[PDB]
Design a protein around this ligand. Sequence first.
Ligand SMILES: Nc1ncnc2c1ncn2[C@@H]1O[C@H](COP(=O)(O)OP(=O)(O)OP(=O)(O)O)[C@@H](O)[C@H]1O
Ligand SMILES: Nc1ncnc2c1ncn2[C@@H]1O[C@H](COP(=O)(O)OP(=O)(O)OP(=O)(O)O)[C@@H](O)[C@H]1O
Ligand SMILES: Nc1ncnc2c1ncn2[C@@H]1O[C@H](COP(=O)(O)OP(=O)(O)OP(=O)(O)O)[C@@H](O)[C@H]1O
Ligand SMILES: Nc1ncnc2c1ncn2[C@@H]1O[C@H](COP(=O)(O)OP(=O)(O)OP(=O)(O)O)[C@@H](O)[C@H]1O
Ligand SMILES: Nc1ncnc2c1ncn2[C@@H]1O[C@H](COP(=O)(O)OP(=O)(O)OP(=O)(O)O)[C@@H](O)[C@H]1O
Ligand SMILES: Nc1ncnc2c1ncn2[C@@H]1O[C@H](COP(=O)(O)OP(=O)(O)OP(=O)(O)O)[C@@H](O)[C@H]1O
Ligand SMILES: [Cl-]
Ligand SMILES: [Cl-]
Ligand SMILES: [Cl-]
Ligand SMILES: [Mg+2]
Ligand SMILES: [Mg+2]
Ligand SMILES: [Mg+2]
Lengths: 268, 268, 268, 246, 246, 246
Amino acid sequence: NSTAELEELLMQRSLTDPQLQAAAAAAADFRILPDATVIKIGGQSVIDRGRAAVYPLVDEIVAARKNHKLLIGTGAGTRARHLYSIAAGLGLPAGVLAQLGSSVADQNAAMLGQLLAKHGIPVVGGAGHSAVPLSLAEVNAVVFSGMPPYKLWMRPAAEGVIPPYRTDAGCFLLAEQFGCKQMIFVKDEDGLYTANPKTSKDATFIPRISVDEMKAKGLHDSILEFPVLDLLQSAQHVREVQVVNGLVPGNLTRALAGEHVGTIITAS
Amino acid sequence: NSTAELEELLMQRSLTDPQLQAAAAAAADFRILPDATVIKIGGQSVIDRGRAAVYPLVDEIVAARKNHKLLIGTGAGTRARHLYSIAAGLGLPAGVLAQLGSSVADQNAAMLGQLLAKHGIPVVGGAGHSAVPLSLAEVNAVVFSGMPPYKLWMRPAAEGVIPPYRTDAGCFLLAEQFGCKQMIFVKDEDGLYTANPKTSKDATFIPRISVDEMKAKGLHDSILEFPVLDLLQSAQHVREVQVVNGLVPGNLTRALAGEHVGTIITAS
Amino acid sequence: NSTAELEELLMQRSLTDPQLQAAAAAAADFRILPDATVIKIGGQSVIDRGRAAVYPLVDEIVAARKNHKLLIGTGAGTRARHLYSIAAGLGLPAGVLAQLGSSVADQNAAMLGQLLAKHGIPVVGGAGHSAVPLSLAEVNAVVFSGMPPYKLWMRPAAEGVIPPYRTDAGCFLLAEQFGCKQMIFVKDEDGLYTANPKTSKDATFIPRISVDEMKAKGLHDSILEFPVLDLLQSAQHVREVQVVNGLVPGNLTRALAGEHVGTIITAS
Amino acid sequence: GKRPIRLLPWLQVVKIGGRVMDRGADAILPLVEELRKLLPEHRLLILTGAGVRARHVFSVGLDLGLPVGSLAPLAASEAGQNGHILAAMLASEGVSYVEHPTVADQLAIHLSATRAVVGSAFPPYHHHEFPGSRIPPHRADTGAFLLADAFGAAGLTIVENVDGIYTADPNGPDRGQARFLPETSATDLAKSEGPLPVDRALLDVMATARHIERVQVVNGLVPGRLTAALRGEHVGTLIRTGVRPA
Amino acid sequence: GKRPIRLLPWLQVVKIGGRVMDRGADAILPLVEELRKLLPEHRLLILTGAGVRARHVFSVGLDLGLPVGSLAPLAASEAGQNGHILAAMLASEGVSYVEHPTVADQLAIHLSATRAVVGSAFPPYHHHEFPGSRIPPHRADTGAFLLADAFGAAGLTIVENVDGIYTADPNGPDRGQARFLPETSATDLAKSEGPLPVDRALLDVMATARHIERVQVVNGLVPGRLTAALRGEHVGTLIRTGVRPA
Amino acid sequence: GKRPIRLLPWLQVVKIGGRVMDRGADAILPLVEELRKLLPEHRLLILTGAGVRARHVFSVGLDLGLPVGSLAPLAASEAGQNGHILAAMLASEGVSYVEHPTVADQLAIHLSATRAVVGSAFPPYHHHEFPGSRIPPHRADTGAFLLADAFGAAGLTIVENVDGIYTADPNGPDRGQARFLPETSATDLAKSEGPLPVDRALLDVMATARHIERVQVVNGLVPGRLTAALRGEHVGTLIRTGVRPA
Ligand SMILES: Nc1ncnc2c1ncn2[C@@H]1O[C@H](COP(=O)(O)OP(=O)(O)OP(=O)(O)O)[C@@H](O)[C@H]1O
Ligand SMILES: Nc1ncnc2c1ncn2[C@@H]1O[C@H](COP(=O)(O)OP(=O)(O)OP(=O)(O)O)[C@@H](O)[C@H]1O
Ligand SMILES: Nc1ncnc2c1ncn2[C@@H]1O[C@H](COP(=O)(O)OP(=O)(O)OP(=O)(O)O)[C@@H](O)[C@H]1O
Ligand SMILES: Nc1ncnc2c1ncn2[C@@H]1O[C@H](COP(=O)(O)OP(=O)(O)OP(=O)(O)O)[C@@H](O)[C@H]1O
Ligand SMILES: Nc1ncnc2c1ncn2[C@@H]1O[C@H](COP(=O)(O)OP(=O)(O)OP(=O)(O)O)[C@@H](O)[C@H]1O
Ligand SMILES: Nc1ncnc2c1ncn2[C@@H]1O[C@H](COP(=O)(O)OP(=O)(O)OP(=O)(O)O)[C@@H](O)[C@H]1O
Ligand SMILES: [Cl-]
Ligand SMILES: [Cl-]
Ligand SMILES: [Cl-]
Ligand SMILES: [Mg+2]
Ligand SMILES: [Mg+2]
Ligand SMILES: [Mg+2]
């Protein structure tokens, strides 16, 4: 379908028209930041734990940016869960909770950024303004808060008022829409298990699994926000993700070097 | 006239006083960004044409910034003309149309900037914050929207509600007030002709001409917003401009190298 | 006191509890920008004097940033005193005057920044976003306005409506809270004297003095905002300051090189 | 437990299609006069869609290969410009355009200050838009509904350039087979394939709605239908969301 | 000469403790109902404190070694979230949350638009917080008073989770020795050592106050006490600031 | 066709000279009292000029060699500070200072919320100021007129520290030859050389005006003249713009 056929459809049809949708699908595919890696630093799993968890990861970030462009997003953690509990008890809707949780991820980005400032790494709003930092060997990394911007327009879950799209989904969608080469989630477990390893004695480690396989095992909502798995299956650019343990020294460095630590989750 | 005479006048007279005006005219002249070049990328003439026009110019920008500091402003184009038509049909004044047109130049700056982000080149508000980008060999260029900030305070034309000061004037005044060394307008024609080359069979190319000569030929409003020619005659720093064809491969690169492609319009 | 004892106190006690205060005092001490120097450029003493004072200091800043990370804050000066006089005559409170004075320090930061833009040095809001500039040899410095952000929440003085915390205090608190290594106040006198050298014939120069010694001599409010001396005695990171004459060529360069020009004021 | 509270239960939300605005003064002036007469009757949040200019920026953006997250904020700009145009025509009545963060956090105080405000119907998904289609999914209809339902508003009325939803595009190739649908459910529409005058994502967010029980699509080119729809009169297509009433 | 003029002499300022908000619906819903009934009686600036979430971010921040200027804006965020929660519950009455710069420069127009606004009680000291303690000094009580006195407001009432000030922490280890103080001076409190339910910095800014003569601390968990305090009735602890009346 | 519509036809715009504000309480307090009594009579946009502090920043800026585009925003800051001072004195009446983007896009809702707002008369030309003179051309008088005419306001009144326009500076060297001009045209003034109490650029924008037919310059140091001018009474210099009435 030529550009001419696409423009005619774009002008004459509703965007809902399947013929228009199909013509747009044939458009060229440009990756905005193809050589960058998006990293999510867990709020509850990492930053909430303080210096014992955060200081080693600061060292890894400083070492890794010598050879890797990094987009580092922060989670929210226990203070967001407290806000969610207060607001949910008041009957407030998901859109209001979404705004509250964003403030907590901002706090964590500020604390992490202040530990990195002397290394030249700034705190930015998001990947939209990472162009100059990522082009400088002196910096080559940025920190941002991982919450998506939906705010009051957050789509609610089928049940309950907890926002379904939180910092895992925010960071993933940033990797996807900027066409980044890699998405790494930094948590407090080695990876995916057959059961929650914190509340199960004999869970088995899973090095590699597809989204479909996860759902068939009953793991749709385990170590990642389960909306992320659905977004992953729809993604154009980021078709797999890696989940690693930020509490193991060097795990992030080794993941960036191509070592298969943790669990690789594939769209297909 | 000493600084003392100027300060006495500044304190005792109205700013309208010719004696005060003349004393201020004798002040020193500081150029803020003397080694930068301002480039306007046409909206209708270039960006509206899509990849066939834009992709080659992205390549030229990336190649040119290795040796030239660049301030790259974007035009608006057909979407602004649609907005102008809607608003003019409603009887809205020039100041309101001015605000509408700014949004379109912002769109074009965003699209061009996203193609340049992986090369380290940011999208900024304007030249006011280009200091660090322009000092880095890795970047050495910025993209901004070319519309002036007048908004509702836009001075209207003598006739009609179309804002007279659009992206040509915005980019020129930026070059002038930052004391840049060169102003290049990138359009879709080789330069100025004796008549509109799109709607005239036998127009003749004009390599070099003064503002006065243009007016005497009836070309006051041809390839540039005609207010720009008047601003050019009043300019302190940028006393000539160059108009080149962005659709000819390498034309921008060759203009930056000092080759006299296109048309040079001089204030005198 | 372990982290566990601190967290229990933080959850169970009022922040006013002396036991909680003492436990927090034992926390680790992180310096955010330990290798940077904060410099205050006086408004009335320097910038208000024009090119004869400002141009030589621009040269020193450009030369000094080759070897020193610089956080350069601007004072306000005579235009702020005019605003203070107008507003005080109207009975407006200190909080309102504080907002007015901030605009003047912003003006001075803009003028100084425009003289430095071609050298790659940006004007920023404050030290919070100086990470990337300070990591680049091409830049290695930023300019900001020195007024604190208290605005309407300014604590008033015991007598009168003049805001007690102005650009000296703003710059000092920035040096203190980012853990910078050095704080230099650039004024229009060689340093501290036994009396105001402008209005006293036989004042004696003081090369080094403590805050306590200053108060005992009746110099609590002389060459620095007297609240600064009290803040200096409470500081964790910046326990002395240096006051130098910006009108003496090279004085700032020599202070940054460790030469004991001017007066060193110590907390103890 | 129970559904969340209604933040602004007295609010009426009206979404104006961008293609209605595209028609210029011929369509806008009658609509502005009808809105003027509605100000004393309702507390109105008026939200504008994007229209044809978003199609053009999609044409350029797709030609440049840009992803869907890049196209979303570009289209949203056009909805905002339509809102500025509409608000300007109502300025003498005390109506102004307000931004997303003001809509999200201060709509209450603004509707205490004046009878109506105008904003953009496009939601702030932008570079965090969902992947899958190269056309941004969460458009003006979807954003207007998300907002109306989050607020617990009294209703959402969609103002179109057609009478409502048909069984085929009433201006398209199969226009001869198009039958008007006075009443339908979001679930029934979602299970259908073919074009609609409303976002397909609208049907998805209707399935998770917590307050809004029905949305009427009415022809803004027929004076009086918006007024009638805001009184609950059936003059267009009624879409049942699946929210059950007390 | 004379003291500065009163900018908003008809204003009543109410500071809601963050630990009151921490109690959730059980405490917030009665407070929201009392505030609803006060809207027609007073022109209210409602300011929220931070509460327990600020203690947690202090725990993490101090563990990371961050200075007091870094902890101040982190705690202020929590006060702002409490304000957004409270404003949402009052949105149907026309109440919205407003930011610091709006509070500082446009409070007049906003209280002309609606009967009450909500904001953060924490002052914008942030990275310019004073050194000395590792716990940020200028907290919610201090910011609320600075604002109220700068405006020349008619009063400031502090809403606590206790009846007022005691001679010891009424929930702490020496709770058995705690005697209730119906009335005290800021100077007398300042010369005392031991915990208080109000910032120690509050006592300092009271010493330089120019208008506010008394501040009452009342139990927000007892319905009606806020209403009584706003009428000058003595239902908690009265703090005399040292400002002398005409 | 026809001239553009009037956006705010019921608006009265008042420009207060910066040199009037420079006189301090002696001039401001009587002006504030007169403005207070005008609030119930008119819907006022009050715009402040820059005054002497802009002359000082011009002195420093020109000594540093800065171009005219750098001096324009520096002078505009001083007009904004004058606006903040004036608004503070009127805060108890519900009046606040509003920024340029609020003036440009939300003036309607703000004048629905309160009877008057204060803003800066300086236009946002800033670094895009026209070259030619080293003194920024588009100053307070010019910005106030551009705004008033763009809005289609009912009038613009300029409040000066002199009775109006003379044939020479009434406080200058040729003050002995200065004859008062009760009435003049912008074109006649433009063809004259010599100082004026209004920007020369004001005369240029009057030539392209679309609504405002006359602007009166009155002495703000004489109580009552502003009140009279807002009722169309001739108490100063009337400037005819060249706009023709129906
Ligand atoms: N099958 C499973 N395998 C591994 N982990 C699991 C599984 N099921 C549940 N989990 C739990 O999921 C948690 C990861 O979610 P968590 O919210 O901690 O991540 P996070 O990034 O810290 O979130 P936030 O950033 O929002 O705080 C782990 O702490 C782990 O205990
Ligand atoms: N005498 C002439 N010589 C050359 N070109 C002329 C002449 N007269 C008219 N033109 C036309 O002027 C046009 C340039 O204006 P145009 O608006 O396209 O520039 P632009 O930078 O794309 O504007 P914008 O950026 O606002 O879209 C050319 O397309 C050309 O057809
Ligand atoms: N004992 C003293 N020794 C030295 N200087 C003194 C003494 N007492 C008073 N001064 C005066 O203090 C002044 C320094 O204060 P000044 O306000 O000029 O600094 P500044 O940084 O320019 O302030 P701002 O930046 O707010 O304009 C000097 O000009 C000096 O005349
Ligand atoms: N099944 C259908 N029923 C009715 N109209 C349809 C149908 N399918 C397609 N259409 C077309 O959709 C058009 C409306 O287009 P669209 O919804 O894109 O405009 P809009 O809602 O004004 O735009 P925006 O979403 O930017 O506000 C109608 O004119 C009609 O031709
Ligand atoms: N002398 C005292 N009198 C009364 N209460 C005290 C005293 N000393 C300590 N407290 C304790 O202080 C508690 C109130 O805590 P705090 O003031 O920190 O909460 P808050 O004011 O809601 O918080 P925020 O300052 O964030 O608004 C009371 O519940 C009480 O246990
Ligand atoms: N022809 C004239 N007629 C009247 N006044 C004149 C004339 N020429 C000069 N002036 C002088 O202009 C002065 C007013 O100055 P100016 O207009 O700069 O102040 P302003 O309007 O308050 O300033 P701003 O433009 O910042 O608001 C008068 O006091 C008068 O001395
Ligand atoms: Cl769709
Ligand atoms: Cl002039
Ligand atoms: Cl304390
Ligand atoms: Mg539609
Ligand atoms: Mg308390
Ligand atoms: Mg004047």
